[PDB]
Amino acid sequence: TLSLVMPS
Amino acid sequence: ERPTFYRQELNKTIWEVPERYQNLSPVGSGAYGSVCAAFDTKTGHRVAVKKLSRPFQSIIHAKRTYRELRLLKHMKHENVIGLLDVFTPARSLEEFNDVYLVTHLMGADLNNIVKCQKLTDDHVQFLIYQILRGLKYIHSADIIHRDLKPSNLAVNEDCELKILDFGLAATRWYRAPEIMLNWMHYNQTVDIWSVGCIMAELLTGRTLFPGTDHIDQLKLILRLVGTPGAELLKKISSESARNYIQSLAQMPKMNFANVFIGANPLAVDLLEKMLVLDSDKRITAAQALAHAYFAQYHDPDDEPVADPYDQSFESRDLLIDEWKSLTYDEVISFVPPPLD
């Protein structure tokens, strides 16, 4: 389950 | 079936929308339309709402407008933008003047994603696969995107991707060479060229062909893939372009492996196959999907094609009001996709 961080 | 609408003024433009869309927030000002982010109470999701600007101002605009509504109405794939909703405040065709489109908001585009983290080879695989999986669909319907680049790729928390903002018949860095100087008419394989430029950039961390002008960039592309061989020249219908090409120092295709040392050999292998100069020898979305590089995501039985897309309208010759009525017809006939 690969995931990313969203830009804030 | 028609909802209650409400009007407000944001950024000196009146928006009239159904009440189901709340907390509208001006995302940006564009020449073709202006887009607000909103909360769709029906779906419980943040969406984007585009008010099209002066859509029936000239024949050209009317036809542009019609073309986008058709194209958007046709798209039904997980890796491509869907039309959530389209509407007009208008209650009849005579008072019909404005068109709004609703599409899903995934919060981030590929540029922004790369901006604040580094992507594992796993991330890159998954992203490209999905780009290719959507392109398979698009292309099977005889659509060309015409514009792929990081900023038309929307990605979420789970690294899911959707393609957006189709060229409607910076950018130059991801364009194929045969269309950058308009050497020949566009094959759907210019999109594959774009994917190659994108993949490389994700892999290495830099723009592959960051040219400043067409000549600068063309020269940059040709140092990698070599100058066009005799067979390629014949296909170019402009003698001016041809004479221009022959004036160039002849060059051999370079060896990619030397250019991408340390990248997955499979990835390089695939890039090789995407960045082929002759468009007729570029790998296809369908072909690319089966590449060993994607062994862990590839499922033949889950990589669907599209229904045929009727584009015969393109060679029609209609009045402004006829393009306008066609469009009103499409707005009226839209069927909202089933709730999830």
Residues B154 and B286 in one domain: yes
Which strands make up the sheet holding B85-87, listed edge to edge? B21-29, B33-40, B45-52, B100-104, B85-87
Inside any domain, residue B125: yes
Residues B126 and B242 in one domain: yes
What's the CATH code of the domain at B181? 1.10.510.10
Residues B183 and B224 in one domain: yes
Q: Which of B121, B165, B269, B278 is catalytic?
A: B165
B28 is in an annotated binding site: yes
B170 is in an annotated binding site: no
**B residues 106-125 lying closer than 8 A (beta carbon) to A:** 107-108, 112-113, 115-117, 120, 122-123
Residues B204 and B90 in one domain: no
**With 0-12 CB in 10 A as exposed, 13-18 as middle and 19+ as buried, what is B281?**
exposed
**Long-range contact list for B19-28, CB < 8 A, 24+ apart?**
B21/B47, B21/B49, B21/B102, B24/B49
Domain that holds residue B325: 1-107+306-335
Taking the CA of residue B116 and the nearest CA in chain A, the distance in Å comes to 7
Residues B246 and B131 in one domain: yes
Residues B88 and B102 in one domain: yes
Taking the C-alpha atoms of residue B180 and residue B116, their distance in angstroms, rounded to an integer, is 31
Q: Which of B147, B73, B140, B66 is nearest to B313 (CA)?
A: B66
Q: How far is CA B88 from CA B5, B111, B200, in A?
A: 10, 33, 42
What's the CATH code of the domain at B70? 3.30.200.20
B329 in active site: no
Inside any domain, residue B340: no
Taking the CA of residue A7 and the nearest CA in chain B, the distance in Å comes to 7
Residues B69 and B8 in one domain: yes
Resolution in angstroms for this experimental structure? 2.7
Our count of domains for chain B comes to: 2
- Residue B332 pairs in a beta bridge with none
Inside any domain, residue B42: yes
Beta strands in B41-126 (DSSP E): 45-52, 85-87, 100-104, 108-109
Taking the C-alpha atoms of residue B133 and residue B151, their distance in angstroms, rounded to an integer, is 18
Give the nearest partner residue to A3 out of B108, B112, B159, using CB atoms.
B159
Inside any domain, residue B205: yes
Residues B167 and B262 in one domain: yes
Residues B161 and B264 in one domain: yes
- Contact A4/B126, CB-based, under 8 Å? no
Inside any domain, residue B149: yes
